[PDB]
Write a protein that binds this ligand. Structure first.
Ligand SMILES: [Mg+2]
Ligand SMILES: [Mg+2]
Ligand SMILES: [Mg+2]
Ligand SMILES: [Mg+2]
Ligand SMILES: [Mg+2]
Ligand SMILES: [Mg+2]
Ligand SMILES: [Mg+2]
Ligand SMILES: [Mg+2]
Ligand SMILES: [Mg+2]
Ligand SMILES: [Mg+2]
Ligand SMILES: [Mg+2]
Ligand SMILES: [Mg+2]
Ligand SMILES: [Mg+2]
Ligand SMILES: [Mg+2]
Lengths: 185, 49, 104
RNA sequence: AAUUUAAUAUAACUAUUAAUAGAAGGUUACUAAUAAAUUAAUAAUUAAUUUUAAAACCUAAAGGUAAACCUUUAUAUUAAUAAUGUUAUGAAUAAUUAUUAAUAAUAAUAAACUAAGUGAACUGAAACAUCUAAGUAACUUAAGGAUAAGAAAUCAACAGAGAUAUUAUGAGUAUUGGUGAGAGAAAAUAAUAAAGGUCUAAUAAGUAUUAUGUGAAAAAAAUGUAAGAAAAUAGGAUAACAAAUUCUAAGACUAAAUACUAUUAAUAAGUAUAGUAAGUACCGUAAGGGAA
RNA sequence: AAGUAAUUAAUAUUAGUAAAACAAUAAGUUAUAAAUAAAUAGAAUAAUAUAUAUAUAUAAAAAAAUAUAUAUUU
RNA sequence: UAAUCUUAU
């Protein structure tokens, strides 16, 4: 097979922003939660952006009679709503799937496994939703593997002292600001 | 935020690092000389015939 | 000698740079991790146990061999025994005629 | 000293070739200004390079709206001080001014070229229904200075080549068609072209393949539904099978020749009704049409 | 204010070259041989067709058709 | 009936 309707997609190349450079005119309010999906978000069978369609877009072709009188028809995939169990998330995740995709999931032995397969083909035939799911699973796996220590209290101890020092000079200091200051330190 | 690397990807990276760590095959001056001499001999033989 | 070597075609020169003749590369398929792994053969990766495709794909390999033949630098290239390709006079001599030719 | 002829302007468009590069409108006013530096070369200088000031309102996307208006309140808080006057008991509570620190904001952005989605009909066939027109017009979406393609699961034929793109021959040949209308390759040889090869992949499975429904007029690679392999001892390629040959899918990157726009130069058996105004006048509710 | 252009094919006239032409990098197109659906076939054994070549047919002729031959190849 | 699906909170 091929992933033509996926890998044809192109997204505007964001310029790498240095810390000292000037701002863009429209900077967003809330930050980027998820990683950027290489292949954007489908601009044709937008039905499939909400689910795990397995790179199965709608076809259009011809109904043909005994007289060979051609008439345009479309061929939809066998989509199905299906709440499937994630071991990593410890909850079942309900989404639209192609019956094919459900079969692949069953073969691979789980939904998390399906999401996390490292092949490029899989990545292509994950949606934007599928990509987000993958990210959620992978991040959770990483957390499980590696808890922070294998600092917050020190910051909390120092904060009031820092505030007092600021006041002695003359200025007031709020926590959020303190946190912002001492993130990289 | 950058997506984390899955297990297979990490293993591949480790393998690549191990490969890099080994001594790299590089074409020595001596090897080039040996080749060049052989080429010359071949040319001489062609000229003769 | 060095000047003569330099005068060799580009692809051949590049090959010699990145797979030099000091290393005696294997005739048979090997581990992908091995130093003597032949770039023309499909070597097996030891962990996954999957045959990797040759480092030099078959066309490129053939071109390299033809270049070597032209400039008489065959034996410095690693062996093409277990790659099924023969070339020119050796191919002509060693081959069996087709069943259709011998037995119509 | 003057006149003529030819060429050249800040001051025409159009076609070609070559080279280079990938770019604000309107509204009406409390009108929407600028300042400098260094470096050659003849203090002022012109030129190059660099810095710097202001710049209203509207042009979907701070929030509205009946474009050039209204409302949000950054000549804002919040805090800390200092000066002032009042209340109640030197300390406390509110208001006004002036410094210091902290908190967010301004989409007018091309058009052509490219890729993807959906996809007509008139028309031709001297009717018309397969076929054609045509994957064209159109609408829709998305990208970049170009895009696309690209280092063979390619071609070929027992000899061999050895990436993609564009053109010439091959060739209107093979091929195909209600065998009508008509449609029509490839190998090979030439140019143009750039260093043109090179790993970034732990070598790829619901994949190849099969059935079935569709699918570039020849030549497939694609695709909905469902069955579904193999390890280089293998796998793809041709009705089929046997021999042989060739290549390695289900992981990737890539200048260059090309397209379009703009600029500059050069050439015009081009234009003065294809020679600069104006998308104005005027017509229409409107999209839109459009003078002299 | 109305037979124009492009890519092609066939004729004619002239001009260049001529058993060759165009092109010169090779490659190609046309000509140089006529046939036949096509095939491994193809033009005086001692001369004008009464000979020869091809297609049908055949042991080989004859028979129909077209083509080839009477110092210099067209 | 933890196949599917409809409704309400
Ligand atoms: Mg605005
Ligand atoms: Mg109102
Ligand atoms: Mg299109
Ligand atoms: Mg008709
Ligand atoms: Mg009628
Ligand atoms: Mg068509
Ligand atoms: Mg590209
Ligand atoms: Mg066509
Ligand atoms: Mg592979
Ligand atoms: Mg493979
Ligand atoms: Mg099929
Ligand atoms: Mg490959
Ligand atoms: Mg690419
Ligand atoms: Mg006969």
């Amino acid at each position: 097979r091929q992933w033509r309707l996926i890998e044809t997609r192109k997204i505007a190349k964001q310029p790498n922003y240095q810390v000292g450079d000037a701002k863009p005119l429209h900077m967003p309010k809330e930050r980027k939660k998820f990683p950027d999906y290489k292949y954007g978000e489908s601009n044709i069978f937008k039905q499939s952006n909400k689910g795990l369609y397995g790179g199965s877009f709608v076809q259009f072709g011809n109904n043909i009679s005994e007289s060979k009188a051609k008439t345009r028809k479309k061929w939809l995939p066998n989509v199905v709503k299906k709440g499937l169990w994630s071991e990593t998330l410890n909850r079942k995740i309900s989404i639209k799937m192609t019956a094919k995709v459900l079969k692949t999931i069953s073969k691979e032995g789980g939904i998390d496994n399906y999401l996390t397969k490292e092949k490029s083909a899989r990545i292509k035939e994950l949606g934007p939703t599928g990509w987000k799911l993958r990210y959620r699973v992978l991040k959770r796996k990483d957390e499980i593997e590696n808890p922070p220590h294998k600092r917050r209290r020190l910051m909390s101890f120092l904060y009031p002292l820092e505030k007092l020092e600021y006041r002695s000079v003359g200025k007031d200091l709020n926590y959020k600001k303190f946190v912002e200051l001492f993130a990289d330190v | 935020p950058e997506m984390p690397l899955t297990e297979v990807r990490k293993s591949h990276l480790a393998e690549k690092k191990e490969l890099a760590e080994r001594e790299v095959p590089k074409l020595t001056e001596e090897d080039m000389e040996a080749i060049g001499a052989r080429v010359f001999e071949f040319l001489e033989k062609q000229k003769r015939e | 000698y060095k000047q003569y070597f330099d005068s060799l075609p580009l692809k051949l020169k590049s090959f010699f740079q990145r797979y030099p003749p000091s290393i005696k590369y294997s005739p048979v398929s090997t581990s992908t991790k091995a130093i003597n792994a032949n770039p023309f053969l499909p070597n097996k990766h030891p962990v996954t146990q999957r045959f990797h495709d040759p480092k030099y794909s078959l066309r490129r390999m053939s071109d390299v061999y033809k270049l070597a033949l032209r400039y008489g630098v065959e034996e410095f290239l690693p062996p093409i025994e277990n790659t099924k390709k023969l070339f020119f006079e050796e191919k002509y001599n060693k081959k069996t005629l087709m069943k259709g030719v011998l037995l119509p």
